């Protein structure tokens, strides 16, 4: 359950998810999962995907998480009228743009890497693709 520590402000504006991803290349491992769609990932989804791969690889190799939530999201309690101030913070999400690399991995065969990432992508709400580290 990734979450920041002592953030400057409890609440922040909704904002927008326009634009294009920055971390579009593999930088740590040899294989990675790239985001094709656009959306937001909650902390729970990131944890679920991480657990799926660790089990798949059987604690062999290394796992890199290239996304952090660092964005609180509020939700009004049930049977509450509009207004009366901003809602309380419930969960943290990370905004994902197309081309963003979600997870990176190294130290395992390419064949075993594909199934591990496929299992993780099955527990994410955004279209994803498998990429390999490029030479320069």
């Amino acid at each position: 359950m990734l979450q920041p520590k002592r953030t400057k402000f409890r609440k922040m504006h909704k904002g927008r998810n326009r634009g294009l991803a920055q971390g579009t290349d593999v930088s740590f491992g040899s294989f990675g999962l790239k985001a094709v769609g656009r959306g937001r990932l909650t902390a729970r989804q990131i944890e679920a995907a991480r657990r799926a791969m660790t089990r798949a690889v059987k604690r062999q190799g290394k796992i890199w998480i290239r996304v952090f939530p660092d964005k609180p999201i509020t939700e009004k309690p049930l049977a509450v009228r509009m207004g009366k101030g901003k809602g309380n913070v419930e969960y943290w999400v990370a905004l994902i743009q197309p081309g963003k690399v979600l997870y990176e991995m190294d130290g395992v065969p390419e064949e075993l890497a594909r199934e591990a990432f496929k299992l993780a992508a099955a527990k994410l709400p955004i279209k994803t693709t498998f990429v390999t580290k490029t030479v320069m």
Binding site: L20, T24, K34, A35, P98, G99, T129, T134, V135, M136
Partner: protein, 94 residues
């Protein structure tokens, strides 16, 4: 044997480059030395096939444009953010 067929670009800009890429053809630039930079266009499918191997960026390459041969080296290249395509290549004259 990295022989690349290239042509001199006629018009430049965001609109021109996007139109060029839509025709399965992407732009590139050659610079270096005391010669003016040369803007070129070249086929995309062929470059993808021969740039897959790791040693494409190792040794010098030869560019054939309008019957002139230029020896270059892959200096920089821009991928598509989420597709297996190329946006631009920077070539340094060797």
């Amino acid at each position: 044997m990295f022989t690349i067929n290239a042509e001199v670009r006629k018009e430049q800009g965001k609109g021109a480059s996007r139109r060029l890429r839509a025709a399965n053809k992407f732009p590139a630039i050659i610079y270096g030395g005391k010669e003016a930079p040369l803007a070129i266009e070249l086929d995309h499918d062929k470059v993808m096939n021969m740039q897959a191997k790791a040693e494409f960026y190792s040794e010098v390459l030869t560019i054939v444009v309008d019957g002139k041969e230029i020896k270059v080296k892959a200096q920089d290249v821009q991928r598509h953010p989420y597709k297996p395509k190329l946006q631009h290549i920077d070539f340094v004259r060797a």
